[PDB]
C-alpha cells in the first residue's frame, strides 16, 4: 500500500527486525567453527538447546500475543532483549562456549530461542493483526525483511575479513531504533464475548481443519527446512576451495534476497485472486522441484538455480499461509495457530526429521537423502490438495 | 566404510599407470570420490575427484589433461588412469570419499575417509 504512516513504521519493523537476524542466522555454523572452534559435530548440542526453548516460547508467543490483541507488550519485551544481541554474542555466548559447551548452549538456547525461533514468527503475527485494520497488505510489509536480511548479509561477508563483531554491535542499534519505530507506531493501548480464550483455543484442536492444515506443515513445510539445513555445505561440494564455494552461496543469498523481496511485493496481487490454499500448494510445489532437483544436479549453475529457487516459494508460503489462516479460521486466534500449528509442530517434526535425515547424510548421502524428503515433500504436497478445505487448483 | 588402492609401484617417465581404489561397506550413491598424493614435503595435493549420474570429473593443475577418472557404480569402484608421467610424479597417492561438513572438493580436509596409500615413483 501506498504512504501510509503506520505501514512505514512496521515496515521499516521487519527491515531492521531481520537485519538483526541476518547477522547471525544465516551463516552461524560459520560463526561457531572458523571463530570460535566448536567441532562441526558438536555444534547438535547447541541447536538442540535452541530448538528445545523455541518448543516452549512459540506456544507461549501465539496463545499470549492474540489474548493482548494489538496492546505492544510482547514486542516491547523482544525488541528489549534485543538490544541485548551485541553483549551476547561477543561477550557472554561466545566465550561461554569456550568455557563449558553445555552451559554456553542453554543461555544461547533461551535467548535465541526467544528472539528469533519463536520472536520472529511472534512479529510475524501481529504485524498481520496491524495489516488488516490499517488498510495494506502483509507481503508488502514483510519483503522489507528480505532486504534487511539482504543487506546484513551483504555487511557481514564484507565485514568477514576485517572485524565481524562490527555486525553485532549494529544489532543493537537496530534495535533501539526497532523501539523508536515501536513507540510512533500506533495501536491499542495498554491498560488493558468475542474476545480471545484459552477455553475456545483447546477447542480449536478439535477442529479438522487445523489437523490437515498440521499436516501440511509437518510433511512438507517441516521437510523443506531440515533440506536447507545443510544445503550451505552441499552447495559447496560443488566448488573448489570452500570460501570460493561460500563466497558464491554469499552472492546468491543477498542477490536472490532481493529477489525474493520483489516476488513478494506483487504475491498478495496474486494470491489474493486465485486463493489461499494454492499459495500453499505453489509453494509446496517450488520446494518439492527443488529437493528432487537438488537430487539430480550436477553443475554449479544446476545448483545455483535450485538455491536461488527458494526465493520464489518463500513469498507464497508466508503471505500464502497467513492468506490461508484468517479465512478457514477465526481471526481472534491467528496469531496463536500460526505460531503452534506452524512453527511448534514444524519444530516439533523438525526434532525428529533433522536426526534421522542426519543418518542419510552419513548412511547414503546428500542428493540421496534429497530424492526422500523431495518424495515426501512432493508426496504430501499431493494430498494436501484435497484435504486442505478451499477452493484449490481446479478453481480457474 | 574404509578404502582399499590397488596399482602404484615404479614406471619409467612417459608410461601409463591405471590406479584403482575400491571399498567395503556401503554404496556410495550422492557419495563422490576423489585422489590426493603427497612427495617428499609438500602437503597433501589435490589430483581428481568424480561424483555419480554424471562424468563430472574435477582434475588440479599439474595433473590435468593426462590424468582421466571413472567411477562405477553397484561395482561401487572407481579408477584412476595416468599417462604420460613424469619425474615430479612420485608420490603416495591416497584415495578418499567426501564429508558432509567442510568446503569443496579440492581440499584434503574436506574428506572424512582417507585410503591408506599407495606409492608410484617415477624416474628417467
Known amino acids: 500500500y501506498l504512504k501510509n504512516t503506520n505501514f512505514w513504521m512496521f515496515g521499516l519493523f521487519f527491515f531492521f527486525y531481520f537485519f538483526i537476524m541476518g547477522a547471525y542466522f544465516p551463516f552461524f555454523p560459520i560463526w561457531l567453527h572458523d571463530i570460535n572452534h566448536i567441532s562441526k559435530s558438536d555444534t547438535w548440542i547447541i541447536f538442540a538447546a535452541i530448538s528445545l526453548f523455541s518448543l516452549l516460547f512459540q506456544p507461549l508467543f501465539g496463545l499470549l500475543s492474540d489474548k493482548l490483541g494489538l496492546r505492544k507488550y510482547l514486542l516491547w519485551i523482544i525488541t528489549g532483549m534485543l538490544v541485548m544481541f551485541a553483549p551476547f554474542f561477543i561477550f557472554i555466548f561466545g566465550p561461554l562456549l569456550q568455557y563449558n559447551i553445555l552451559v554456553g548452549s542453554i543461555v544461547g538456547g533461551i535467548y535465541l530461542g526467544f528472539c528469533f525461533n519463536a520472536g520472529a514468527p511472534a512479529v510475524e503475527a501481529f504485524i498481520e493483526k496491524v495489516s488488516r485494520r490499517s488498510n495494506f497488505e502483509f507481503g508488502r510489509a514483510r519483503m522489507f525483511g528480505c532486504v534487511g536480511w539482504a543487506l546484513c548479509a551483504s555487511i557481514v561477508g564484507i565485514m568477514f575479513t576485517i572485524n565481524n563483531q562490527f555486525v553485532f554491535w549494529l544489532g543493537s542499534g537496530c534495535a533501539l531504533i526497532l523501539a523508536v519505530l515501536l513507540f510512533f507506531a500506533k495501536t491499542d493501548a495498554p491498560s488493558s464475548h468475542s474476545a480471545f480464550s484459552l477455553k475456545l483455543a483447546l477447542e480449536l484442536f478439535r477442529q479438522p481443519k487445523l489437523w490437515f492444515l498440521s499436516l501440511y506443515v509437518i510433511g512438507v513445510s517441516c521437510t523443506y527446512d531440515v533440506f536447507d539445513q545443510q544445503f550451505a555445505n552441499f552447495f559447496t561440494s560443488f566448488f573448489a576451495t570452500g570460501e570460493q564455494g561460500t563466497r558464491v552461496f554469499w552472492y546468491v543469498t543477498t542477490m536472490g534476497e532481493l529477489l525474493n523481496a520483489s516476488i513478494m511485493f506483487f504475491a498478495p496481487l496474486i494470491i489474493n485472486r486465485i486463493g489461499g490454499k494454492n499459495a500453499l500448494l505453489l509453494a509446496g510445489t517450488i520446494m518439492s522441484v527443488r529437493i528432487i532437483g537438488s537430487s539430480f544436479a550436477t553443475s554449479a549453475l544446476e545448483v545455483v538455480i535450485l538455491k536461488t529457487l527458494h526465493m520464489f516459494e518463500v513469498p507464497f508460503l508466508l503471505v500464502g499461509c497467513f492468506k490461508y489462516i484468517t479465512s478457514q479460521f477465526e481471526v481472534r486466534f491467528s496469531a496463536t495457530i500460526y505460531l503452534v500449528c506452524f512453527c511448534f509442530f514444524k519444530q516439533l517434526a523438525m526434532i525428529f526429521m533433522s536426526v534421522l535425515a542426519g543418518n542419510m547424510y552419513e548412511s547414503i548421502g546428500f542428493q540421496g537423502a534429497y530424492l526422500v524428503l523431495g518424495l515426501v515433500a512432493l508426496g504430501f504436497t499431493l494430498i494436501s490438495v484435497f484435504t486442505l478445505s478451499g477452493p484449490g487448483p481446479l478453481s480457474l | 566404510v574404509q578404502l582399499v588402492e590397488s596399482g602404484g609401484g615404479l614406471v619409467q617417465a612417459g608410461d601409463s599407470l591405471r590406479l584403482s581404489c575400491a571399498a567395503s561397506?556401503?554404496?556410495?550413491?550422492?557419495?563422490?570420490m576423489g585422489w590426493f598424493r603427497q612427495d617428499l614435503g609438500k602437503e597433501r595435493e589435490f589430483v581428481a575427484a568424480?561424483?555419480?549420474?554424471?562424468?563430472?570429473?574435477y582434475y588440479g593443475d599439474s595433473v590435468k589433461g593426462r590424468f582421466t577418472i571413472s567411477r562405477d557404480n553397484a561395482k561401487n569402484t572407481v579408477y584412476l588412469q595416468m599417462n604420460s608421467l613424469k619425474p615430479e610424479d612420485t608420490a603416495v597417492y591416497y584415495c578418499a570419499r567426501q564429508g558432509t561438513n567442510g568446503g569443496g572438493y579440492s581440499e584434503a580436509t574436506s574428506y572424512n575417509y582417507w585410503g591408506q596409500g599407495t606409492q608410484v615413483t617415477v624416474s628417467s
Open positions: 561397506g556401503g554404496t556410495f550413491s550422492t557419495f563422490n
Open positions: 568424480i561424483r555419480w549420474t554424471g562424468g563430472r570429473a
